[PDB]
Subunit: 228 residues, 3 copies
């Protein structure tokens, strides 16, 4: 099989979610955090032609940057990975499945309770400023006919009543009320425009961020509240 | 209120002199080191619309680099600060004036003993070489008809007798003799061309560095000597 | 003296092998690691007009990037070094020869047992990959009519049996068999194209990497075997 730079770039975003991964034959990739808070999946243009688990995905990807962009990769005689370059060969260890955490099946996200969206710059600003104001948690809520994202410092603001940041998304004429809480540490979303689908059913809350390139599913906090 | 790139640049310099600052209505800004060693002021093109003290100027400025050109800085209803545009709002704490140190009056330099100048590139060299030569002290003295700056490491050269760096400024057309000492740690001046005025009267010694953008007043060390 | 960007570039590589160095009059420079593993020499275009030992070559070189490219370097009246710039002077200490380690005479490499070569692009990959794969040892051997380099991690593969990398160098039709082991830590070779001269006689084994810019002599490990 071959890995293009586009695929490689998405795999690099995945490695920040889980340092390891299980690649399965097909044009599809997915991963899930060890703590189960963040899920990611994407359709790729490359065809994976063998199943193999990688313990250190990031270092593997970096190694691909050192060989021909069309380097052919396959499983070697010893069960490990072989990377065939023009005049050289790079062998990389194949991990035993038991040493990495991975999704056994893709996530089928429920029908959304509410849909909104965030633009590339807005997302970029939220991520940029969150780090500078120690925003460790955000809340997506309905306010004044709009869906808004408030950022807080859970540590010194245990009740999330003093926002240090606020971003307006889309208009909301709906009937329901909600305050979905997200741990900023799970927002490993790569830059881009996303359709945001929020879901709540009793004590179960989750969010899905979808772009033309990747889809993420992030679990929401227990202090979340909704009318649905 | 809006702060352009240049004003922000100058404020960043001021932030390195004193972590805090008091901003007052007008087109003028000034600050001073907590230990009173370095003073700086400048006239700016941006109009400050309200009085406000910032406890951590540097972090505040870095935050400004993340807002849009449409963002506008203003006093929020809670007495704190707000930086908002059409889509988002960043909140920042307005400090209690008593939690910071600031000049209640600008420092003037009515008279001088000797006047010289240092070009932007020479100031740049002095700053960079001192960093690599562990120079913590400089002396501006007259030698063979010229004004020169000698750099030393007082830590291993108590008498300041072994210069590690020497910079020639201008031809000295005077009859006096001097050796003004400046703690290099107080030379927190931004890059640029500066007119340098040195004043000495008995135990009192001070220097003024003036560029078209800002001007500083620096307290010189007791080690200094002169016959003015 | 005057040191061109080219000579400085070479000296920097030399500083990675031994922090100090001894400059002798002429247009030749050399150095050797304190542990004796690697030696390096070069003929430069700049004429060294006085002898001086440098305790910290790397810091010296960085200081030179702060002055004009044509600054004059010489022996000061105090026995130390003087670097004369257009409008300034930087002083640098001349080390006592007994505080640094240096070759007393250049290395006369024996006539080679086998000769091969490595392209700049291939050396670059070798060096880069080694870091990403934790390769601490390489072996240059004859395999299927060619000379190849295999990279290993000796900590987990002491018998050097499980190659993590392999690079094909040149065709080989000799009768001799050899497995020359080199410690990757000693491969502090600057980029370029090199003629590789391998030598073995009984338990003495050594390699020489030669380019038109620099020459390196590296001692090879005891694990090495050959039938020369």
């Amino acid at each position: 099989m071959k890995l293009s730079k586009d695929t490689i770039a998405i795999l690099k975003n995945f490695a920040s979610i889980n340092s390891g991964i299980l690649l399965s034959q097909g044009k599809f990739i997915m991963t899930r955090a060890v703590n189960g808070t963040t899920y990611a999946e994407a359709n790729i243009s490359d065809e994976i032609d063998f199943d193999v688990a990688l313990y250190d995905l990031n270092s593997f990807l970096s190694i691909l940057s050192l060989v021909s962009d069309d380097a052919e990769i396959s499983m070697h005689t010893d069960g490990n990975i072989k990377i065939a370059d023009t005049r050289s060969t790079v062998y990389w260890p194949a991990a035993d499945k038991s040493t990495i955490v991975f999704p056994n099946k893709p996530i089928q996200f429920p029908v959304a309770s509410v849909i909104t969206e965030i633009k590339a710059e807005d997302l970029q600003q939220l991520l940029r400023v969150s780090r500078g104001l120690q925003i460790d948690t955000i809340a997506i809520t309905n306010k004044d006919g709009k869906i808004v994202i408030n950022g807080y410092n859970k540590v010194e603001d245990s009740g999330l009543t003093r926002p240090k940041y606020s971003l307006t998304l889309t208009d909301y004429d709906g009937s329901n009320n909600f305050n979905f809480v997200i741990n900023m540490a799970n927002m490993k979303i790569q830059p881009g425009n996303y359709k945001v689908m929020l879901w709540g059913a009793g004590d179960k809350v989750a969010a899905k961020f979808e772009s033309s390139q990747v889809s993420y599913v992030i679990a929401m906090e227990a202090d979340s509240t909704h009318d649905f």
